Ligand SMILES: O=C(O)C(=O)Nc1sc2c(c1C(=O)O)CCNC2
Ligand SMILES: [Cl-]
């Protein structure tokens with residue numbers, strides 16, 4: 001790999017067994033309890049009833065009334081990278097979302113969806129669109145201000161100021177918004193996906209000096225899983241002597257120990273292969 005991975009890719013392509021391989025992954029994936037996610041009191045904190053964090057990896061809010069947020073810590077030990085994957089916040093969980101960003105000391109938020117997709121609400125408007133209209137989250141005592149945005153053709157980078165209204169301490173949060181990645185679909189090219197990923201890496205947001213980057217789409221599993229799988233596989237291919245031993249299927253199953261349903265379609269799995277192959281070549 002890239003040679004060994006590319007060879008494997010062409011073989012799967014030739015036999016047309018992407019769907020078969022993807023289904024194998026779903027069958028083999030971990031099935032851990034999500035008791036807390038499924039408590040009655042948490043019903044309104046979940047966007048989709050079929051998408052919940054495992055108890056063992058769920059992010060806990062440091063709040064005395066209810067610690068629950070639909071978010072999971074994905075800790076890739078060998079790759080030496082962590083991510084927080086979470087659903088697109090609901091109108092009632094935006095305060096929670098930013099409480100999590102604050103408490104976990106994250107530097108970046110990666111958003112891979114749009115607020116409305118095909119006429120359906122997929123994510124709350126959880127950040128301010130206008131500088132002069134800041135957002136105040138009274139429940140978690142946080143204020144959020146748009147400082148600037150860098151709008152590119154297929155993604156936007158925003159500078160946000162998150163302020164703890166209790167202490168008046170402020171932090172700069174980078175918001176990386178992929179705006180042309182359709183739900184249950186794939187990016188328009190490996191190149192544009194990789195350019196985006198590299199921008200996130202270059203920002204320092206994935207650095208161990210900060211808390212884990214927060215990654216989300218609508219459910220925090222399909223597009224989110226695709227993004228994280230590619231990043232981790234690229235790390236492995238660069239850190240392993242004999243990078244040929246990087247088995248994307250095994251890495252995805254390792255990730256799914258931490259959150260269910262990562263990568264939601266066979267074509268997203270196929271795209272992950274392409275991204276990793278093309279990216280390996282660029283980095284090598
Ligand atoms: O946003 C994504 O990329 C993603 O995984 N979305 C998902 S996963 C998922 C759903 C959705 C959705 O957006 O409707 C609906 C219920 N089943 C699981
Ligand atoms: Cl949007």
Ligand SMILES: [Cl-]
Nearest residue numbers: 090121123124
């Ligand atoms: Cl919503």
Ligand SMILES: [Cl-]
Nearest residue numbers: 245246247250
């Ligand atoms: Cl591997």
Ligand SMILES: [Cl-]
Nearest residue numbers: 026261262264
């Ligand atoms: Cl699945």
